[PDB]
Amino acid sequence: SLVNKAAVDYFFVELHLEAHYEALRHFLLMEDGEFAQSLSDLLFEKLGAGQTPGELLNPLVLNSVLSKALQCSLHGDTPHASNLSLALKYLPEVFAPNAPDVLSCLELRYKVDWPLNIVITEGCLSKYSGVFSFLLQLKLMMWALKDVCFHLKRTALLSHMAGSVQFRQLQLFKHEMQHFVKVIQGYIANQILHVTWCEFRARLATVGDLEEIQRAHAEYLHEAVFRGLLTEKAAPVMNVIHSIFSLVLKFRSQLISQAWGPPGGPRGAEHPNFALMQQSYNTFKYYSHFLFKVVTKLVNRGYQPHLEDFLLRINFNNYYQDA
Amino acid sequence: LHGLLLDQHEEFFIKQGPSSGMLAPSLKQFSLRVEILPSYIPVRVAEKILFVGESVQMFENQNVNLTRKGSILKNQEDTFAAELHRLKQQPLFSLVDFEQVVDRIRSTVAEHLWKLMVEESDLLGQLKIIKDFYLLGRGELFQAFIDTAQHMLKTPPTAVTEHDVNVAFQQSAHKVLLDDDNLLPLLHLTIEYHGKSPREAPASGWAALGLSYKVQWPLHILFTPAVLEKYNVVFKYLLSVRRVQAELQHCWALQMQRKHLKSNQTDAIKWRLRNHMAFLVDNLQYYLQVDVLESQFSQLLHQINSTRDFESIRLAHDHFLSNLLAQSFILLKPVFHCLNEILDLCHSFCSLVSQNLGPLDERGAAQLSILVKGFSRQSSLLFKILSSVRNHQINSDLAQLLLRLDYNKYYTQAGGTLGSFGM
Amino acid sequence: NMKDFENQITELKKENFNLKLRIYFLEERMQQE
Amino acid sequence: MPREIITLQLGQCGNQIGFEFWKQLCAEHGISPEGIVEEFATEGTDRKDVFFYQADDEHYIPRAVLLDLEPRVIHSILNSPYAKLYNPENIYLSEHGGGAGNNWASGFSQGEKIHEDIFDIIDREADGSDSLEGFVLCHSIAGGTGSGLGSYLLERLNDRYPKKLVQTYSVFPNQDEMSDVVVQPYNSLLTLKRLTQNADCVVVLDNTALNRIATDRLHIQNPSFSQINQLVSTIMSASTTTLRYPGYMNNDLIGLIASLIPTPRLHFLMTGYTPLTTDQSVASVRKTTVLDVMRRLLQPKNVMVSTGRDRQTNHCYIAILNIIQGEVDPTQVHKSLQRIRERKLANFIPWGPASIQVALSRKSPYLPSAHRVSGLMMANHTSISSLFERTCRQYDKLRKREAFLEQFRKEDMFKDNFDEMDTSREIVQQLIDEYHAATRPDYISWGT
Amino acid sequence: MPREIITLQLGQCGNQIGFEFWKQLCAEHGISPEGIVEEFATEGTDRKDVFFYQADDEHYIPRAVLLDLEPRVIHSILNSPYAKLYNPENIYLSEHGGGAGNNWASGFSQGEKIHEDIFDIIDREADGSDSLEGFVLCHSIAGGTGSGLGSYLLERLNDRYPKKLVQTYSVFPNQDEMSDVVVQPYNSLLTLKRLTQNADCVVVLDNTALNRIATDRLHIQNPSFSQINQLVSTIMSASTTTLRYPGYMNNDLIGLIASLIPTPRLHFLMTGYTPLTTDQSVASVRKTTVLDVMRRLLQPKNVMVSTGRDRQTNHCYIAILNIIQGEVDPTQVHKSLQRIRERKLANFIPWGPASIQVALSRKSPYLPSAHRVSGLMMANHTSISSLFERTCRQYDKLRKREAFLEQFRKEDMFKDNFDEMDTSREIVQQLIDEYHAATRPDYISWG
């Protein structure tokens, strides 16, 4: 007991485990919201322009993006943000269009010194890097769709295309997809990023030994993965979510590929990809209804009780139940 | 002292029993070897020793999971060891002194266990939860739940329907303003019946629906599987009673909804039969609640508050449960079956009355006549049974029910049969 | 990772340069003796 | 969710009765007259959602609609501390304040003028009710405003909630008091008509019996019409406490009325209460036993219906349910059931099972009970036919005599003839005969 | 990086709203009335650059361009606590001091006279903005100065940033309160016209709802234009805290509004806040749960839109997003969704997926929050059309009645008729009809 107490005190005061968790929150958890926004916008600009990993993930380009995001972040200049490093898992030849996993090659690594690397294991840092990569990919897809939306908005403003039936339908589909994505993101943030983080803090406050600290960190990461839908039980669900994000990105790409035309007729302005955007919207709606039905069947099957929370987040206003 | 059966060669008069059990190996891990029990060890004394050893094993098993809370006797364990050493120094084995020491240790342990169970382990809270849910203690809440979920639970249960039923129960609780998120997790829906495995059932999914309650340690010792099964039986029974009450209320609502419709003789007869069935069911349910359920619960609470022995509390709870089971006639298999048949006839009558606002159609008239004959025969049988039980003084509650049914002597004048609804 | 790789590369370059300087002065001394 | 009941307050007298009922309900639930729960209202065992709606996150407002053809009672409610109890969208007050002139038809026409507003109010209250069971109309049947407005309210409840029960509180005229409402028998006829056609259950409140109870039990030498209406509201509250204060029994209106309504038309209930104590006599806690209570309940003086001595009908109880509130000893309950059966305090129908039912319920912790043990009996008793036959005979006598009908002839319901009063009298006579039949084995066909 | 917003303050109400907003922002960031960070304001975690510019390392100046046709509002700002917060070169006050005479056209003409100065101020504020998205003009549509100057400011923002989005918070006249600006419906119509032509999204703020909330919830019997503007500024601050205090969610205005604006034409937004508390009731930090919050949100006293009782159209929410800031338990959020569903507290569009998005935002560390959890809701609700339809009906009634037109007749735009106001009312009516249509499945084919 004396050894355990002294070890807890050493880990807290000397190894700054709480400070390490704070650094992970500041840098790896994108607590600097401005840095995350700038990173997402730059990432979606590079991905939508089709830059290759050798062009986009070039150390000069990555370092410039990081410097700009940190300079725009209120927390980007903090010493906790300095522990963040952007590394490449692999170099893609081409950025796949509308791929939700396009930015999964990016990894945020956290360095743990001795003895903290016994508790903050390379496996823990790898799981954190995977979570960071997934959040970065999702932010890239959301940013790409936002950039497509802004392009359509600017084209409508320049061309008075507010009356376009095709443009209005595409905009409504984009808005509904963005609402769904933001609800899902809020759910994931609350469960994995907020609830699991609070659980980790309570557990980090309760860690008694280095093996107990390692167990607490592994539990934190497991809760983050499970609430993050990264578990094998959620692998079919995570794959379906990734497919939905890919379809949303494809719709975004179809909308953004061309600016709105001038309003030429009573139907308003026509988009050259208007038929493709409408087809993408119809496919998104069909896939959303199928996802809702699958999640309902799984919840009623008891296999994935957290998917009941996921279904609630998807169908919070019962919009998908009535459709 | 340690709940440890240190018998590798079976030399002691105690034999390790099969532990029924971090479900810690059930105190039946050790058992009395009656074949090996010394004739100088009295059977009563052997039972006392068994209780002491079981208590020690339970205490060790709990301290395995419980933080290092010391023995109930703490440092007095060594004092009893010194007393045992003096007994070893006694030239003659006295069962009296050994039994006295064992009883002192048992009493100390039982008082500390009772204190831990009631204050530290809140046995009363768990019993209240079980009463409210398993015993339908929240009768208004469970009534509202039945009223809301009836459309889901009238159909055969499914393996997924259990989730839907638990969701409907939570929704009704919120509607009944039962916003206890801790109780709903204690409530567990049950098991697919009759097509919605849904393969096996006797009656229909509505009868197969049950509630399970997760008993926490150490109270799982109190809520034994047989206790949980009795609670589930009580839940099923209360749900059936509430369903029949709701059916009678729906027949009343249909009559009231049809009050602008001219009451025909068939519709008046249907409504009258529904009213008689509702009166009888209400009086039976009031009898079960107050004279059986409330009486037994009051007795249990008074005994629990009057005793400082955890074993005394367990005995009181078992007595309460036994009295409930006896007064509910559940043990009286033929009486229970007759009551179930009467309830099914009453439900069919209530459905017929609720469906027909106006005079009964030919199908409605046939259903009304069949229900009237069934109800009159079953109620005559029930009245005869109740009068027989009163005459035999077997069950006070049955005599109270018989008195309540023939209070205005209508059933006595009607021969104990609920009057035939004239179709 | 990346910042740690940067630090390792920078340290290794500094150590190699310091060793090269020490070698250079050692060779000049051995050429003077 | 609780089975919510909408309270309809009709006309001047009915609106006064409703206001006093809402005051009593607030006191029983510990609700302030402003709709705020009193600190004393710690007994969360009552079903407020049955009778009250939440006006805000903190204020519970009674689901009561105050409708009058005379401004005095409605304005007094709206000028009382209880102004916030009623839904303001459910409050219709006649601008003219003239009332119905003791004419049922005028009250009915006033209800018809506010028919759209009244049914909008009813629908709003139903949407404000989580599990609205139906409508309960509180009114007097003897006046002009309360009777006609009561008939209108019953009609609108039937129109808006045709599958929901519609209960009415129909005050039969006092036979010992001179009613100032000369058209009361006509008013009674219109109310009985609406109870037969548009209400699902009619609780007959004979003002003669209310006055008798006030004199003998409440020690009120001259019960005022306001005092009679407040007594009726108190009696209704006590009888409905098990619905409003949920317990083991009578947790829903349909379950409560199921035992009471032998036929859909035969929905005229009589009430009884025991032990009866005067508000002033709270000082002496009389050790009234349940057996003594049951013995007193069989006395016509304790029945909330003043039945004439009908010599033609072998009056009997069709059904009896005793809801007892307060401290009750089970041995006393057993002695009470024994005494009721042994004393034949209720004679039952031969056509179905009937007894004196006893339900035990806790009392409201917020309402001080003047009696250590109290109980309300609601009963269908063939002696109510003598009350129902008397109401029918008075209706026919008024319609045939056009007494006080000139005030009603201004309103369309009575402008050309009183045929609706005569048909109502005939329906009430058939109800009386059925109640006499309900004492007979032919009760299976009673009300056909 | 944050999406910076340039604030244009027009007329008495707009200037009052700006002054109260700057006071609230200063208090939340620990900024002195002079724009200097207070010594206690050590939490450098707030994003001042979205709405404020730094005049020095210590002095924060609002990225605000002040344009008014009446000198009264400028004098009230200079007498406000925020008088030293704003750069004096970014404040444009009409030299004539005569105001607009409650005439939108006069205010617009004065804005046109100060167009160069106003757009220079807006550009100066944008340069103080690290990532200026565009300009947001805060004004009232009911007065003369705030309406005309607001339209002028919107026009100049559209001229300078034609490829950038321009959202406006346009306060529509109170329909339940008697406006002292008898020409208020014409002014409101002109402001709605400018929002339709030069803004990309107009969030309709019905002054009737502000007055109703002040009466029923804040217990303010007669909300002043300054008091209504200060309530609007407080609501805007609470809704913008996630933009000003960056966190995991809602770090930009566009992220918040994306879920709210389904189509470019269906850009009339309604706002919601929960829990709603009166300014006097700050004392008791109620442990409000998400279920309790959601229940309070359904109370009209907390809705920032005064929808008329339409009996013919079942106006409904297409989607609702609540951004909640503070200590929030996810289990409480789950219970809130459950209670809302059981109570049917939110109706969504039936033709597509819609949900309640949840954004978590940090509170200002320098400002003690009386609420453990606070939240802004952005929702698309067909009842928001009722505010726009009511504004249009009032405009049409005034133009058809020529009411208060003599004050408008002084300005050339309104000298002969109010036909521009009536056409604006018709456009706002079409917007209302589209917003009601957006509750329906056929919104997919709108336009």
PDB file of C-alpha atoms in Angstrom, chain B residues 286-349:
ATOM      1  CA  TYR B 286     -58.575  -5.463  -3.465  1.00  0.00           C
ATOM      2  CA  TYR B 287     -58.631  -8.606  -1.317  1.00  0.00           C
ATOM      3  CA  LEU B 288     -55.317  -9.784  -2.747  1.00  0.00           C
ATOM      4  CA  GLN B 289     -53.749  -6.338  -2.351  1.00  0.00           C
ATOM      5  CA  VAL B 290     -54.898  -5.489   1.166  1.00  0.00           C
ATOM      6  CA  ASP B 291     -55.662  -8.767   2.929  1.00  0.00           C
ATOM      7  CA  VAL B 292     -52.888 -10.757   1.250  1.00  0.00           C
ATOM      8  CA  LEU B 293     -50.335  -8.395  -0.252  1.00  0.00           C
ATOM      9  CA  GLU B 294     -50.599  -5.419   2.104  1.00  0.00           C
ATOM     10  CA  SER B 295     -51.065  -7.632   5.162  1.00  0.00           C
ATOM     11  CA  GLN B 296     -48.034  -9.773   4.342  1.00  0.00           C
ATOM     12  CA  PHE B 297     -45.926  -6.733   3.456  1.00  0.00           C
ATOM     13  CA  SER B 298     -46.873  -4.978   6.696  1.00  0.00           C
ATOM     14  CA  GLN B 299     -46.034  -8.124   8.663  1.00  0.00           C
ATOM     15  CA  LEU B 300     -42.708  -8.444   6.844  1.00  0.00           C
ATOM     16  CA  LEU B 301     -41.839  -4.783   7.441  1.00  0.00           C
ATOM     17  CA  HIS B 302     -42.790  -4.992  11.117  1.00  0.00           C
ATOM     18  CA  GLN B 303     -40.728  -8.150  11.615  1.00  0.00           C
ATOM     19  CA  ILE B 304     -37.763  -6.673   9.737  1.00  0.00           C
ATOM     20  CA  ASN B 305     -37.875  -3.549  11.886  1.00  0.00           C
ATOM     21  CA  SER B 306     -38.313  -5.717  14.984  1.00  0.00           C
ATOM     22  CA  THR B 307     -35.361  -8.053  14.349  1.00  0.00           C
ATOM     23  CA  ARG B 308     -31.599  -7.539  14.402  1.00  0.00           C
ATOM     24  CA  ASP B 309     -30.776 -10.989  12.973  1.00  0.00           C
ATOM     25  CA  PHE B 310     -30.269 -11.212   9.220  1.00  0.00           C
ATOM     26  CA  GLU B 311     -31.398 -14.846   9.316  1.00  0.00           C
ATOM     27  CA  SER B 312     -34.524 -13.723  11.158  1.00  0.00           C
ATOM     28  CA  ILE B 313     -35.135 -11.209   8.371  1.00  0.00           C
ATOM     29  CA  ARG B 314     -34.700 -13.948   5.764  1.00  0.00           C
ATOM     30  CA  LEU B 315     -37.145 -16.184   7.628  1.00  0.00           C
ATOM     31  CA  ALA B 316     -39.627 -13.304   7.855  1.00  0.00           C
ATOM     32  CA  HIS B 317     -39.339 -12.644   4.122  1.00  0.00           C
ATOM     33  CA  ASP B 318     -39.819 -16.326   3.330  1.00  0.00           C
ATOM     34  CA  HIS B 319     -42.881 -16.362   5.594  1.00  0.00           C
ATOM     35  CA  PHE B 320     -44.274 -13.263   3.879  1.00  0.00           C
ATOM     36  CA  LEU B 321     -43.734 -14.883   0.480  1.00  0.00           C
ATOM     37  CA  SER B 322     -45.324 -18.140   1.644  1.00  0.00           C
ATOM     38  CA  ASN B 323     -48.365 -16.289   2.995  1.00  0.00           C
ATOM     39  CA  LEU B 324     -48.681 -14.379  -0.279  1.00  0.00           C
ATOM     40  CA  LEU B 325     -48.445 -17.619  -2.268  1.00  0.00           C
ATOM     41  CA  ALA B 326     -51.024 -19.320  -0.059  1.00  0.00           C
ATOM     42  CA  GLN B 327     -53.570 -16.510  -0.064  1.00  0.00           C
ATOM     43  CA  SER B 328     -53.218 -16.028  -3.835  1.00  0.00           C
ATOM     44  CA  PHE B 329     -54.278 -19.697  -4.238  1.00  0.00           C
ATOM     45  CA  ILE B 330     -51.262 -20.212  -6.516  1.00  0.00           C
ATOM     46  CA  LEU B 331     -50.513 -23.409  -4.614  1.00  0.00           C
ATOM     47  CA  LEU B 332     -54.134 -24.523  -5.065  1.00  0.00           C
ATOM     48  CA  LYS B 333     -53.574 -25.835  -8.588  1.00  0.00           C
ATOM     49  CA  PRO B 334     -57.258 -26.599  -9.330  1.00  0.00           C
ATOM     50  CA  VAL B 335     -58.350 -23.287  -7.823  1.00  0.00           C
ATOM     51  CA  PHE B 336     -55.626 -21.470  -9.762  1.00  0.00           C
ATOM     52  CA  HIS B 337     -56.716 -23.171 -12.994  1.00  0.00           C
ATOM     53  CA  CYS B 338     -60.377 -22.360 -12.353  1.00  0.00           C
ATOM     54  CA  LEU B 339     -59.416 -18.737 -11.711  1.00  0.00           C
ATOM     55  CA  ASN B 340     -57.424 -18.656 -14.960  1.00  0.00           C
ATOM     56  CA  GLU B 341     -60.389 -20.053 -16.901  1.00  0.00           C
ATOM     57  CA  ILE B 342     -62.685 -17.504 -15.243  1.00  0.00           C
ATOM     58  CA  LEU B 343     -60.265 -14.712 -16.150  1.00  0.00           C
ATOM     59  CA  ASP B 344     -60.148 -15.864 -19.776  1.00  0.00           C
ATOM     60  CA  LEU B 345     -63.954 -15.983 -19.918  1.00  0.00           C
ATOM     61  CA  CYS B 346     -64.153 -12.513 -18.361  1.00  0.00           C
ATOM     62  CA  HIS B 347     -61.602 -11.169 -20.853  1.00  0.00           C
ATOM     63  CA  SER B 348     -63.590 -12.622 -23.757  1.00  0.00           C
ATOM     64  CA  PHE B 349     -66.781 -11.087 -22.339  1.00  0.00           C
TER      65      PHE B 349
END
